[PDB]
Amino acid sequence: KKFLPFQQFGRDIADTTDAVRDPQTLEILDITPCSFGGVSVITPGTNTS
Amino acid sequence: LVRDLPQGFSALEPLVDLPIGINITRFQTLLALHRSYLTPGDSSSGWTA
Amino acid sequence: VQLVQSGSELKKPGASVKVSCKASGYTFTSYAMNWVRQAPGQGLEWMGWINTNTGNPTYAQGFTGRFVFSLDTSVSTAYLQISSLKTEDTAVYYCARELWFGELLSGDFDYWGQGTLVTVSS
Amino acid sequence: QCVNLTTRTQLPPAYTNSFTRGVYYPDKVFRSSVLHSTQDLFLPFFSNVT
Amino acid sequence: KGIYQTSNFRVQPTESIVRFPNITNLCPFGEVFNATRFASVYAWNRKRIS
Numbered sequence: 250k251k252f253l254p255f256q257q258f259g260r261d262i263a264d265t266t267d268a269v270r271d272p273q274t275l276e277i278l279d280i281t282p283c284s285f286g287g288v289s290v291i292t293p294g295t296n297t298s
Numbered sequence: 299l300v301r302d303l304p305q306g307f308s309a310l311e312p313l314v315d316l317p318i319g320i321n322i323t324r325f326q327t328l329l330a331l332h333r334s335y336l337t338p339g340d341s342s343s344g345w346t347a
Numbered sequence: 348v349q350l351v352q353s354g355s356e357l358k359k360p361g362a363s364v365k366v367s368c369k370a371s372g373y374t375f376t377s378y379a380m381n382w383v384r385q386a387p388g389q390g391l392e393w394m395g396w397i398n399t400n401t402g403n404p405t406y407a408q409g410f411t412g413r414f415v416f417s418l419d420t421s422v423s424t425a426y427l428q429i430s431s432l433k434t435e436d437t438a439v440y441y442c443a444r445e446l447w448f449g450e451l452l453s454g455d456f457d458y459w460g461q462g463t464l465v466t467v468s469s
Numbered sequence: 470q471c472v473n474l475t476t477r478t479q480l481p482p483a484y485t486n487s488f489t490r491g492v493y494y495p496d497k498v499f500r501s502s503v504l505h506s507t508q509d510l511f512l513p514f515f516s517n518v519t
Numbered sequence: 520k521g522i523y524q525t526s527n528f529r530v531q532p533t534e535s536i537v538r539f540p541n542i543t544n545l546c547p548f549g550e551v552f553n554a555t556r557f558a559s560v561y562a563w564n565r566k567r568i569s
């Protein structure tokens with residue numbers, strides 16, 4: 250994602266940062282949240298085991 | 299083109315921000331002036347557009 | 348920018364006809380209106396121009412009286428009216444667009460219409 | 470020093486149509502493949518321009 | 520016996536990185552805080568710090 254020289258970091262439809270400029274190397278880096286998900290537990294009941 | 303404003307669409311990038319704090323109510327533009335040997339006279343009339 | 352005119356017509360000699368000209372796609376009051384004719388087999392003849400702001404016509408030589416220029420603003424359609432038609436008036440009339448520069452006009456004809464073919468015969 | 474310009478024809482200006490011009494970037498935010506609404510000063514479409 | 524949604528997992532960050540521009544010179548705060556004379560309210564001074 251090329252950036253025009255006037256503009257700082259961008260945004261998405263969720264109002265979160267997605268791309269940013271480095272303040273030293275003046276390069277463009279993408280930001281993505283790391284892995285996450287739900288936790289579900291399989292149990293045969295508290296009576297069996 | 300020749301003599302008219304063209305038909306099309308364009309997006310204007312910002313150029314510079316000028317914090318001046320002054321009050322502006324009127325404005326005027328600056329134009330050039332051509333003087334040569336085909337325009338005799340004084341400085342008030344010896345010119346071409 | 349389109350310049351559509353009225354269709355062709357046939358008329359007996361001695362009567363009077365009116366030719367319209369509709370303009371679109373551009374601001375009518377900004378540019379003046381010029382008229383030109385072309386008899387079949389020869390070149391272009393210019394009878395004059397009419398201002399689109401004040402509506403004043405300016406006829407050339409030999410076209411005074413018989414030729415009438417008139418405009419309007421709301422409908423924004425030019426008109427050409429010729430009275431006492433005879434055999435030599437058989438020609439096609441073209442509308443010529445000329446931008447308003449002042450009391451002296453230039454020679455830039457940028458846009459033309461499709462023309463209206465009239466024919467005076469018995 | 471100042472000098473007044475002579476031999477110039479004083480004439481009224483004219484008008485023409487601005488075909489969807491005057492659109493600028495409203496902010497310094499990069500966006501891609503999204504229809505974004507805004508409320509700011511803009512040139513209205515098909516306006517008279519002197 | 521059955522399925523139950525309990526909580527959520529996430530990758531904890533390993534460290535932290537701070538990105539700041541290459542700059543070393545200090546702002547002259549004492550120029551405006553220890554100035555010899557101050558302008559009036561109706562003619563208030565405006566100075567740029569950058």
Ligand SMILES: *[C@@H]1O[C@H](CO)[C@@H](O[C@@H]2O[C@H](CO)[C@@H](O)[C@H](O)[C@H]2NC(C)=O)[C@H](O)[C@H]1NC(C)=O
Nearest residue numbers: 340341342343470471472473474475476477479
């Ligand atoms: C050019 O002409 C103008 C007049 O059209 C001169 O305007 C002066 O305007 C001030 C206030 O706007 C008046 O107090 C002066 O009396 C005007 N001058 C005169 C001579 O009437 C303007 O000075 C002219 N430029 C130069 C360089 O003389």
Ligand SMILES: *[C@@H]1O[C@H](CO)[C@@H](O)[C@H](O)[C@H]1NC(C)=O
Nearest residue numbers: 292293294295296297298520
């Ligand atoms: C476990 O289930 C059996 C029947 O499947 C039942 O008889 C027994 O009482 C249960 N255990 C407990 C601790 O309730």
Ligand SMILES: *[C@@H]1O[C@H](CO)[C@@H](O)[C@H](O)[C@H]1NC(C)=O
Nearest residue numbers: 318319320321322323324325
């Ligand atoms: C700027 O000058 C005009 C000229 O009379 C005045 O009406 C206006 O109040 C001033 N201030 C602003 C903020 O426009």
Ligand SMILES: *[C@@H]1O[C@H](CO)[C@@H](O)[C@H](O)[C@H]1NC(C)=O
Nearest residue numbers: 374376484514515516517518
């Ligand atoms: C532009 O001006 C012309 C004549 O002055 C008028 O007919 C037209 O409606 C105007 N258009 C707009 C968008 O103001």
